[PDB]
Amino acid sequence: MMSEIIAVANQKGGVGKTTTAVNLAASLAVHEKKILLIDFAPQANATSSLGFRRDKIDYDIYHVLIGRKQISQVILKTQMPFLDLVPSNLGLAGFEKTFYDSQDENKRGELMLKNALESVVGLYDYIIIDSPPALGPLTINSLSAAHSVIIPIQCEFFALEGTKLLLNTIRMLQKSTNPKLKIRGFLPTMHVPQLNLTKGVLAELFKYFDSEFFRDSATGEYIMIPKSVKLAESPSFGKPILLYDIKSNGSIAYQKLAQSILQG
Amino acid sequence: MMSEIIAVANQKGGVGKTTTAVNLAASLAVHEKKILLIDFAPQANATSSLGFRRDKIDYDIYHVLIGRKQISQVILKTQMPFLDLVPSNLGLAGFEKTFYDSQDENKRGELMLKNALESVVGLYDYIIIDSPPALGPLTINSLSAAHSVIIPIQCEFFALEGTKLLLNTIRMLQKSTNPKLKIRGFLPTMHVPQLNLTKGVLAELFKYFDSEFFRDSATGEYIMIPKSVKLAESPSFGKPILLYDIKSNGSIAYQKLAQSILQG
Amino acid sequence: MMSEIIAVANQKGGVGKTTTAVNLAASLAVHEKKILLIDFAPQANATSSLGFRRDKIDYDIYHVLIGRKQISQVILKTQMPFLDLVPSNLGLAGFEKTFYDSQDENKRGELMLKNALESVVGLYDYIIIDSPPALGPLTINSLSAAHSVIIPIQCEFFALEGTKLLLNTIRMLQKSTNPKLKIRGFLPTMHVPQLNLTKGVLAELFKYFDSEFFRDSATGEYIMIPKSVKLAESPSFGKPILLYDIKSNGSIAYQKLAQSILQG
Amino acid sequence: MMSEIIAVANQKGGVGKTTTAVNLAASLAVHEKKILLIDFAPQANATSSLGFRRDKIDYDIYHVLIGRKQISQVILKTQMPFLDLVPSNLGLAGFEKTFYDSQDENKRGELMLKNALESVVGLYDYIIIDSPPALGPLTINSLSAAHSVIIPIQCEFFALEGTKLLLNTIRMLQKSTNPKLKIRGFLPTMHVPQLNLTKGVLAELFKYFDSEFFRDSATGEYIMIPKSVKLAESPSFGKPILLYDIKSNGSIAYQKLAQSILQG
DNA sequence: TCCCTGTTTCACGTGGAACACCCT
DNA sequence: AGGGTGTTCCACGTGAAACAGGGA
Ligand SMILES: Nc1ncnc2c1ncn2[C@@H]1O[C@H](COP(=O)(O)OP(=O)(O)OP(=O)(O)O)[C@@H](O)[C@H]1O
Ligand SMILES: Nc1ncnc2c1ncn2[C@@H]1O[C@H](COP(=O)(O)OP(=O)(O)OP(=O)(O)O)[C@@H](O)[C@H]1O
Ligand SMILES: Nc1ncnc2c1ncn2[C@@H]1O[C@H](COP(=O)(O)OP(=O)(O)OP(=O)(O)O)[C@@H](O)[C@H]1O
Ligand SMILES: Nc1ncnc2c1ncn2[C@@H]1O[C@H](COP(=O)(O)OP(=O)(O)OP(=O)(O)O)[C@@H](O)[C@H]1O
Ligand SMILES: [Mg+2]
Ligand SMILES: [Mg+2]
Ligand SMILES: [Mg+2]
Ligand SMILES: [Mg+2]
């Protein structure tokens, strides 16, 4: 049995990668698939959105990579039966020392997350990883551990040069440490369809990348997460948008996204 | 003559650090004060916002920190006569390794920017530093070099946790590397007043922090940068907002911010 | 022992004359003051609102106006010991002929209600008159027999022309038939404050009339009867709203109205 | 051509008779049929809804019945080309004496409006007559003039007793003065489908009257005018709803009403 | 059987942003 | 095209009313 490993990644800050990672893991779990969410960010917002406050987590993801803990020891069960979580902390910031000290000897350490994952790749249908807003060692680990990658795009000017940067980082990993990697899709998020900027940013991206954007395969239309404040309120209750408000615009787009993952 | 050096910092991604750093440095410079803007981010969104392209620039700030260049060589003149820019590149992400090699040697290297800025500080009234989304080495450098620090707040749930721990980084360095360091002010960003998440997030923030919020000395009112899509448009035109739409509310709010900073 | 006779009048249909007349008379009678309620409408909705079937009572007010009955025989004891009712039939539309044969004859016909009320005026603290939607004879009698007049205002467009029109009827009789007659107050009815029609109608009304709007003497605030569907439900059960839902906002507002009338 | 003459009638005040009569006459005129709106009420709200002022109306509907003018003199043209209006004044209140002065001799005068309509029944497809809130001479005249009768029903407790009375008045006239009179339909107005009262009132009415309610001939569903404050704002601009807001719910139901009339 | 308190559900005002004139 | 205007569209807060347990 094999888990599909998905990275949610962008180096631009505040683009919905944590909201995607939490609400994609949720929307997949309600289809009765076995889901593991890795909060791979030092800010650890994905953990906080599931209602586990940072201070009361005993041992975390940082302890796994060093070899201090097994990954199954740190796995927590969430509110949903088919959702499980590997949390994060401020302690994850110290991974960057551990990475670069390992680089100057064996040049591995991009793979520290893959080898951590190895034990649990057969208990899950899906393992979703939430990355920080940078192209450093945390993100690089996640891209190296992943079968595929979901890219949230806030359609605003810096996405343009930013996306081509992220894909270029993706190309050089395919050709080195992770050939098995694929672009799972591009996910327009915080989407406000009528803005001129949103139109104009989409048009430049569709120009190069259109085949790569998520289709609802049923109706052919694009899957885009609308700007909805209930998506934003939802982590204050420690719940994904499913449990919080299931009929809202955002939850709908997150369910539709789950189906397009499941069709292939 | 000593520059006041103001780092614009928040570790949460996408809260308007770059938009604020670009616009304040512009709004300060129309008063005929000499301003240097430092793009301290590998994403290099500040350099993009002033109409440069990072593929086409010769030497960046990474070449200054490694000592290869003196900082007055990499300085570019912008479209404004009082605004100069130390640009940045993806190559600034290479500073990551170098920090933990300088931590390994001197137990310093947080002061690299501080020692780089020493040649140009009698040359400008204000130096504005745009920090990346982390508590990692670059932001610590931006903070350890600075007299004061602006904290842009997008008024949403992750800010409650996130501001708190940024302050503790500030209190750490206020006891350690940079005891002179001041909090310049709290700057509400992307502000939509009528929203119950925005109200409640600002409510929780006001009981702890109210004295640290930027105010308009004429009216006594809070200075808050409104959500205006024009603020997002101007970097596509390679411009600060005052050269784009000077009458727009975002331009008005950044110039109010500028005036309250110039007062001391 | 002299009754204050309050005509509840507006020529506009459906503005809450009957609801106001029925509910004020109940709210005055729980203060243990004796109230006579006069259904001066052929539609006879007031009689229906107290739970008396139109076809099941012997003689009505029409029979007093034509002299066939002394009014004290036509009086009925309601479910409240302090509320009595002069009921009405469809027969009261038969006053219409009889009026235009009275000024023909004696130049009276204005005063028949005034003279019918002569036997019972020393017998009640308050007498409440519920008038039909016209400036014709029945409203005229109702207005000419009254010490004071309540004007219910549905705050909507026709009220502007409608209220101004009624006042000229009022000041005509103040100049002629009944000079002692005073406006008791304006009573906003079916009130929904948030509506811009309601704000605009009330505003145009306030510049001419504000002094004559009913106020709560304790808080200084206006007395307005809200839209509450409990008020509309109450006559189906044959009750005033204090016998239906005494806790509802519409009940509170009529009791405030009652309190304001009792005090002066 | 013989005009179909339609009375909008009910003796309950403020149930939407004028709003029905103006907006039905309007919704018929956009179908390129020739429409004459007789404002037959003393309060004259139909006229005021079309942006005509009482102070500037020269000779009115009162003058036609007294023989002071022929009807084609007093007819005015509205904003719409296919909508003509016969206006009213405060002077129409003096019709009531003329009726019972003709009753004292020859027992006619119920037919005074019909006889006045003789010259214009061939110049119009539709003549919409708006009656006052009573069963006296003005309503009777127009009920005797009309081919059919539309009953607006505000679904609230007094509709029950009021309707039985208005149907019974129709039976008296079907027997005597106007045998050709049909009930054109029942039109629920100010409709709020959620309320317990509204349900409860309709259920007692459907019990006796169901086939008499207006159906959409297309869908089969009932046609009811919804409570919309745009319907209320609309006369303040001197416009029927279809010029004011043609999109709004109120205008839609009034259009569907016009369609059902147009199929006979 | 009388009560209480959450959730749904629906009309209506609010303000941002696009856009179509319209100025001249 | 530059600078008004107002008009149209869309999210989101607001509060009334029904309803569903949950109260023993
Ligand atoms: N469609 C949406 N509508 C409204 N708010 C959203 C939406 N998606 C995400 N958010 C909110 O926007 C903010 C940024 O989203 P999020 O934090 O998931 O982005 P991020 O890329 O994870 O940020 P970081 O760069 O710190 O990792 C959060 O406050 C979140 O609550
Ligand atoms: N009213 C506003 N104020 C600030 N930024 C805005 C506003 N409206 C839109 N934006 C846009 O919001 C986006 C995020 O802002 P910005 O990139 O300045 O945040 P940041 O803190 O620099 O993010 P990063 O962590 O990626 O550096 C940008 O695309 C900017 O163009
Ligand atoms: N404050 C209120 N809120 C809700 N419904 C009300 C209110 N006041 C009255 N009603 C209802 O509104 C309708 C009109 O009220 P009412 O019959 O008292 O007006 P009116 O002035 O007596 O009209 P008319 O005498 O011309 O028929 C009735 O159905 C009544 O049940
Ligand atoms: N949804 C609606 N449908 C009909 N009328 C409405 C609606 N909303 C508000 N109104 C208003 O209802 C009020 C009474 O309606 P209207 O005046 O047409 O009834 P009416 O029977 O003509 O009254 P009158 O008894 O004075 O003749 C008016 O102020 C009208 O503007
Ligand atoms: Mg995140
Ligand atoms: Mg930035
Ligand atoms: Mg009445
Ligand atoms: Mg009317």
Numbering used by the authors:
A (entry chain C), B (entry chain D), C (entry chain B), D (entry chain A): 1 to 264
Show passages lifted from the paper.
The ParABS system, composed of ParA (an ATPase), ParB (a DNA binding protein), and parS (a centromere-like DNA), regulates bacterial chromosome partition. In Helicobacter pylori, ParA and ParB homologs are encoded as HpSoj and HpSpo0J (HpParA and HpParB), respectively.
This conserved Lys227 residue is positioned at the core of the DNA binding surface, between the DNA backbone (4.0 Å) and ATP (3.6 Å). The HpParAD41A-DNA complex displays a higher resolution of 2.6 Å compared to that of the HpParA–ATP–DNA complex structure (3.4 Å). The ATP-hydrolysis deficient mutant HpParAD41A exhibits low ATP hydrolysis activity and remains in a dimeric state while preserving DNA binding. Therefore, the HpParAD41A–DNA complex may adopt a stable conformation with bound DNA than that of HpParA.
